Amino acid sequence: SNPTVTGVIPSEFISLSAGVIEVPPNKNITLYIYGESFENVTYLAFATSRSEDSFSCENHRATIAFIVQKPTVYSLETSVLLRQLTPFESAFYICFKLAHPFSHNNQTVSWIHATPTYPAAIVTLRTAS
Amino acid sequence: NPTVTGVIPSEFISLSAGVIEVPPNKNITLYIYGESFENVTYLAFATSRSEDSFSCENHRATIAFIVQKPTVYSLETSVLLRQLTPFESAFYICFKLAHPFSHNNQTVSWIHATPTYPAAIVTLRTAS
Ligand SMILES: *[C@@H]1O[C@H](CO)[C@@H](O[C@@H]2O[C@H](CO)[C@@H](O)[C@H](O)[C@H]2NC(C)=O)[C@H](O)[C@H]1NC(C)=O
Ligand SMILES: *[C@@H]1O[C@H](CO)[C@@H](O)[C@H](O)[C@H]1NC(C)=O
Ligand SMILES: *[C@@H]1O[C@H](CO)[C@@H](O)[C@H](O)[C@H]1NC(C)=O
Secondary structure, X not given: OOOEEEEEEEOOOOEEEOOEEEOOOOOEEEEEEEEEOOOOEXXXXXXXXXXXXXXXXXXXXXXXXXXXXXXXXXXXXXXXXXXXXXXXXXXXXXXXXXXXXXXXXXXXXXXXXXXXXXXXXXXXXXXXX | OOEEEEEEEOOOOEEEOOEEEOOOOOEEEEEEEEEOOOOEEEEEEEOOOOOOOOEOXXXXXXXXXXXXXXXXXXXXXXXXXXXXXXXXXXEEEEEEEEEEEEOOOOEEEEEEOEEOOOOOOOEEEOOO
């Protein structure tokens, strides 16, 4: 019932280190996101800081929303443009907007952190700082 | 017949022209997404593929890796890939099907996986 991400395949990437994919900043790239329970997913955005104790991305969202295509029930395709991280930002963490809000601490939340299908999944991006 | 849409290695080094480089001689886990995976029992790789390829029976260049089926659209498998030879270009996915079939009067249970769409990222390689 919550989206789960197995892997992220960027159309362009520079390197891989510690489960984070470096991609070109300020360039249109296409992300291929594979996973499960993507049905209620309408938009993708990124947070620049993720606590492991994160479910609601509502305040941590640091990017505009990118529309996602759904070629399949196991796949998402989306076009993103990522801005050089700031010195205070560590990485880009995937967030999903759900087509139906839900209740957290009596505030409605539509943005959620993507949860990895397996703990070691590569589901984090970064750009040059 | 099975179709592979995407391949997610748990560890990889680079991407270029629809081929994902992975660490040689290391245990890595592959999540293979695609369709018509019902009769698929095992995973192997070929080192040479003609577009007019259907039977991988003679092209298999690796031992078979057993596949789990977390979903009807996915295969989960742990593989260890050997550094390619100078004569080999890449690792092309092959599938073992339950129930053999006959092609050129030869019994064949291994078939080349075909990409769902032509631009799919569905090929692996290791350092030569
Ligand atoms: C998409 O959103 C709908 C809306 O809630 C989800 O449908 C609910 O599913 C639960 C359990 O399957 C049922 O008990 C509810 O009655 C359903 N409600 C409606 C209005 O259909 C659906 O599960 C969501 N999709 C995913 C993949 O989680
Ligand atoms: C590779 O994975 C298989 C399956 O888990 C395991 O039996 C084998 O020992 C692994 N190889 C190494 C070098 O760990
Ligand atoms: C699995 O094998 C059975 C028996 O031949 C067949 O009916 C079925 O279509 C096969 N599955 C696929 C996806 O071809």
